[PDB]
Amino acid sequence: STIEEQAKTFLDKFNHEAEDLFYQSSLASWNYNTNITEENVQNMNNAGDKWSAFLKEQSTLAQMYPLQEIQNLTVKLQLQALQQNGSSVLSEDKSKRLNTILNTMSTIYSTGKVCCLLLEPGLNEIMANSLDYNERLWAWESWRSEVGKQLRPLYEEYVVLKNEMARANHYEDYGDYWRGDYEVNGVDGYDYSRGQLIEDVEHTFEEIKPLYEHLHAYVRAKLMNAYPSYISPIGCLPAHLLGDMWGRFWTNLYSLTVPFGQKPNIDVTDAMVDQAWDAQRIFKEAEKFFVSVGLPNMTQGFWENSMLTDPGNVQKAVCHPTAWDLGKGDFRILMCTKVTMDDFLTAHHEMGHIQYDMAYAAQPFLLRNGANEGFHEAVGEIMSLSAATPKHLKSIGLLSPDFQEDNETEINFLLKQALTIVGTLPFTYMLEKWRWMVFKGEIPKDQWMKKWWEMKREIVGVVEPVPHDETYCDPASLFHVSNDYSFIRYYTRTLYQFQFQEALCQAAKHEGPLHKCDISNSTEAGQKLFNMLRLGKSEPWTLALENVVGAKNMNVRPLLNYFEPLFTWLKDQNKNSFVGWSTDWSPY
Amino acid sequence: SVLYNSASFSTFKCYGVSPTKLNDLCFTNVYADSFVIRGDEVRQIAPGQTGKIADYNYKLPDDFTGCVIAWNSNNLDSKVGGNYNYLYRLFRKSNLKPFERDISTEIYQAGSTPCNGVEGFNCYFPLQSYGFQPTNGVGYQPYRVVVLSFELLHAPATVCGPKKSTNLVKNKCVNFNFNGLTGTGVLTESNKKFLPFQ
């Protein structure tokens, strides 16, 4: 009969059996987290084995159905996640060799060879809060001469294996496969191929470049009082003076730089003790945030199936901020909720992932999840950003409604968020572009460390403290590279964090910056956000973006409105400090 | 009337005939269609709906003038660890007429590969299973729906139940309605007993 009619029957049969197998793998993982036992580890492996075997079995029979004969512009998006092959498309002997490289980069990164102590939070707190030039430099050089030296033969074979695997699925290289998630493959009219992702990203970096120059020059000028000999006003910042092994997280450098000493950063910990909270009480206060905005309420079985309190040290249990999704209406959360401000900001960041899956609960399993990677994290960042605004917390439970800040307080708030949100923005764009040249062939095999430091001074602005040879290796020690994860998911998270906040605050009769917008007591911002959160994998992200913001690509303009008081203050404080930097100065 | 104010049913709705009017009305014969479904399928049990449940399992007539009894449950039809004892038909070669049962088992045919005793490609198993688990949400909870059908034929109805009784007062010129006779007079004690069937 009809080819498109029989294709829906094959997908309904898969969804009626995949939800039962996926729920078993998620239920077995919760048993190990509740009680640390060796029996729960085997149950999780046996549950995941049948999931990988049933998915691979149905993927073989799905290749017989034609993909180009889809005219409904909906079934094609459901066959892409089913007909996937992954790293098992090559030979059987090369499958175990490629997976072994991922374990070698993770074993060395997990173990500590510096004496003993680990990297995080062990060595991370050493090269940040010590205030010395010869102390934090020896720890950074010892890590590259032990960890980076044992990754040269492993990283060379990682490029040749990922290149052959990518060409088997009709592509180009490893970097081209990551760009295919943003390609529109469903509804036509909004053309956005993989080649379009090369642009736009490079255009927004030029407009945000003057903003990054005022932030990097402020941190460089602060350390001149402690290092008057090495650090020069016309120089830069070495790799060991960034508070991180690679310079990604710059939050550790906030303890050394102080913008104003009259007003300290805001803290809502004192308001939690006055209202007598029991840790669980935080989950009750976080529920009213989603009800008064327009989003649906929670479920009845969420307060009895998910962990809400702390089990203590007497019970073997683990906890880490995470978004668990068991499926079939079952949702659980595993976070050691305490009584402080750190656990209150991370509560709303991970609660948005639970409300995301509840939007498309009635939709089939194939239509769940977004069409592009990194879009789920943008839903959680817009919720945690509003949880720290003093103008928003005055209309709910914690805090006093008669609480406001001045201009001296906003400086300390915008500077702290600039070392985490937009602090890792140039670092993501640097590695995303550098890997596209190594996988293709624009960089020789013996020029990986030479070209690495050349792109730092042109994008991030970090000089080379120790000239590396052809034996060291920096990108292989990354948590995303060692686990076969794409680093591009954090780039779109920063841009989409301010675009979604600008759209929800625009309909609520509010313009200008986004450090004082109100989210609660507004049923219009929640109804507009719920539109694209129900679509999922049924429609591409280009069409779903117009339902909230009103564009098809990223835009750095909403990002500049949030840091408007910070960009103006950093202009007058860095105009005596050589705004920017020069690539002529060298530390060695 | 005693089954409406009990406050023990989650959904007690009717169609056409009001719940406060069928208490003193005769009925030729009343059926009893009992079945256990999910939570989202309760809205589909209505005269004039369609989908994958009302057109393949229980079909309601267009002139249905009865009631739909449904209550919440999770212990009388769902055990610990998941209950997969209630099956249902998802796809079939044809629809089902109202008031008709089907206990056969056949393989659905999608496009080519005629399906008759052979499964695999282009042939799927329609008889699935509900996911009645106590750890799921609210929409996945089982609901034991009992649909009652009302019909009227030319045969004399044996189920009516007209009205309740009152007190007895004599030596007064009040109104009384014994059986179908309405009379107004003084009721006095009589010693002339009639026949034991008049």
Closest CA to A494 of A97, A296, A211: A211
Which position among A240, A348, A350, A539 bears the catalytic label? A350
CB contact under 8 A, B111 and A13: no
Backbone angles phi, psi at A306, to 5 degrees: -110, 150
Q: How far apart are the first and last CA of chain A?
A: 74
Q: Which residues in chain A have Cβ-Cβ distances shorter than 8 Å to B110?
A: 1, 5-6, 9-10
CA dist., res. A27 & res. A48, Å (int): 11
CA dist., res. B145 & res. B32, Å (int): 10
Give Cβ neighbours of residue A404 (< 8 Å, ≥ 6 apart): A390, A391, A394
Number of H helices, E strands in chain B: 0, 10
A3 touches chain B (CB under 8 A): yes
Helix (H) or strand (E) holding A289: helix A281-291
CA dist., res. A169 & res. A177, Å (int): 9
Look-up of token digits 């490629």: A98
Q: Which residues in chain B have Cβ-Cβ distances shorter than 8 Å to A12?
A: 90-91, 124
Please name every residue paired with B36 in a beta bridge, in sequence order, or none if there are none.
B144
Alpha-carbon distances, residue A114 vs A22, A123, A128, A257, A465 (angstroms)? 41, 9, 16, 28, 19
CB contact under 8 A, B136 and A330: yes
What single letter denotes the amino acid at residue A31?
N
Q: Is the peptide bond before A121 cis (omega within 30 degrees of 0)?
A: yes
Closest CA to A196 of A542, A564, A587: A542
CA dist., res. A549 & res. A520, Å (int): 19
B139 touches chain A (CB under 8 A): yes
Alpha-carbon distances, residue A191 vs A71, A372, A543, A555 (angstroms)? 16, 15, 11, 18
Q: Is A524 a catalytic residue?
A: no
What single letter denotes the amino acid at residue A482?
S
- A239 half-sphere exposure, CB direction, 13 A CA radius: 21
Q: Render B148-191 in DSSP notation, one character per residue.
A: E-EE--SSPPSB-----------SSEEEEEETTEEEEEE-----
| Cα three-residue angle B129-B130-B135, rounded to 5 degrees | 135
Distance from CA of B12 to the nearest CA of A (A): 22
Residue from A30, A69, A330, A354 whose CB has the most chain B CBs within 10 Å, to mutate: A330
The answer to whether residues B46 and B62 touch, using CB atoms and an 8 Å cutoff, is no
B4 touches chain A (CB under 8 A): no
Q: Token pair of A240, please?
A: 């060991």
Give, as one character, the DSSP assignment of residue A511: -
CA dist., res. B183 & res. A357, Å (int): 71
Residue from A2, A3, A11, A13 whose CB has the most chain B CBs within 10 Å, to mutate: A13
CB contact under 8 A, B111 and A1: yes
**Domain residue ranges of chain A, discontinuous segments joined by +:** 1-588
CA dist., res. B45 & res. B49, Å (int): 7
Which position among A4, A480, A510, A524 bears the catalytic label? A480
The dihedral built from the CA positions of residue A329, A335, A336 and A341, taken in this order, carries a sign that is: negative
CA dihedral A508, A513, A519, A520 (to 10 degrees): -90
CB contact under 8 A, A1 and B139: no
Q: Specify whether the backbone of A400 is left (phi greater than 0), alpha (psi in -120 to 50) or beta.
A: beta
Helical H runs in A86-169?
Answer: 92-110, 135-144, 152-167
Extract the runs of DSSP E, i.e. beta strands, from A440-564: none
- A220 half-sphere exposure, CB direction, 13 A CA radius: 29
CA dist., res. A497 & res. A376, Å (int): 11
Resolution in A: 5.4
- A80 half-sphere exposure, CB direction, 13 A CA radius: 22
Q: Is A17 a catalytic residue?
A: no
Look-up of token digits 């060799």: A97
Q: How far apart are the first and last CA of chain B?
A: 32
Look-up of token digits 């002139």: B63
